[PDB]
Amino acid sequence: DISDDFFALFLDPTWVYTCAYFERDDMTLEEAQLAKVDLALDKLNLEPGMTLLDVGCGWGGALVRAVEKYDVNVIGLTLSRNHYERSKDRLAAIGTQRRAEARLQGWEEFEENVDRIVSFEAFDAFKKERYLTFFERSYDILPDDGRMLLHSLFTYDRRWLHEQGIALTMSDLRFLKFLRESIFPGGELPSEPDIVDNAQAAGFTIEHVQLLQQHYARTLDAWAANLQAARERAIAVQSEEVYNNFMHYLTGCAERFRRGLINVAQFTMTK
């Protein structure tokens, strides 16, 4: 696995490794990551004491913000031990009377009632055979007035891209191979209908779709600039091969968000 010490060289202090939201053009990376979390959590209409489930909680940045700003009980799920350990430690260091727990557990095994669900860039890594099952389970554990904010990457097919004046280049195919054949996201993404049609089949209404395509291009630019500035320490923690691979991933994904080849969006999902 890639060490937390490597990610610490280019992530902001929230340890959020998903698309930020530069709500104001002059926000720092940290302010834009908190704005992204707040943007999602505001759509859930949280009241203090509600229980929020975070599917794919990462290193705990969103849950920590959820407790601190919104005063909710939180459950975070992750299958990554490095993610679980940091989430566990950070939530315990919060001074709160609320429940704040991280679990080394997949959503497929989680069956408690919660009031609201949020998920940042976990869905686009699910198997397509689990798309509907995820929304059926999400629907089932939410109350009658429950809400879910699904933040997810998705891709476009050749024909839609052509209608938008975009074509995939040989360079784009070589990058697509490098994704699947290495350890990075973006390979085998869902389409937008994969999200919308399965969510609606499970009974959800799509209240709102907010695209963040160019916010991700800026986020990836910032991670790449941070990593370049810390290149020597990055190579010491890992290796030159890993540094160059990460730099190829970050700049290559930023380029393809700017070109419009893929997208990222927050789907406000109601019952």
UniProtKB/Swiss-Prot annotation:
Pathway entry: Lipid metabolism; mycolic acid biosynthesis
GO molecular function terms listed in the Swiss-Prot or TrEMBL record: methyltransferase activity
Pfam families: CMAS
Keyword hit for S-adenosyl-L-methionine: yes
Protein name in the entry: Mycolic acid methyltransferase MmaA1
Recorded name of the encoding gene: cmaD
Binding positions for S-adenosyl-L-methionine per the UniProt entry: Y17, T18, G56, C57, G58, T78, L79, S80, R81, N82, H83, W107, E108
Protein family according to the UniProt entry: Belongs to the CFA/CMAS family.
Entry EC no(s): 2.1.1.-
Keywords: Lipid biosynthesis, Lipid metabolism, Methyltransferase, S-adenosyl-L-methionine, Transferase
Active site: C253
Catalytic EC class: transferase
Annotated function: Involved in the conversion of a cis-olefin into a trans-olefin with concomitant introduction of an allylic methyl branch at the proximal position of the precursor to both the methoxy and ketomycolic acids. It directly affects the cis- to trans ratio and indirectly affects the keto to methoxy ratio.
GO biological process entries: lipid biosynthetic process; methylation
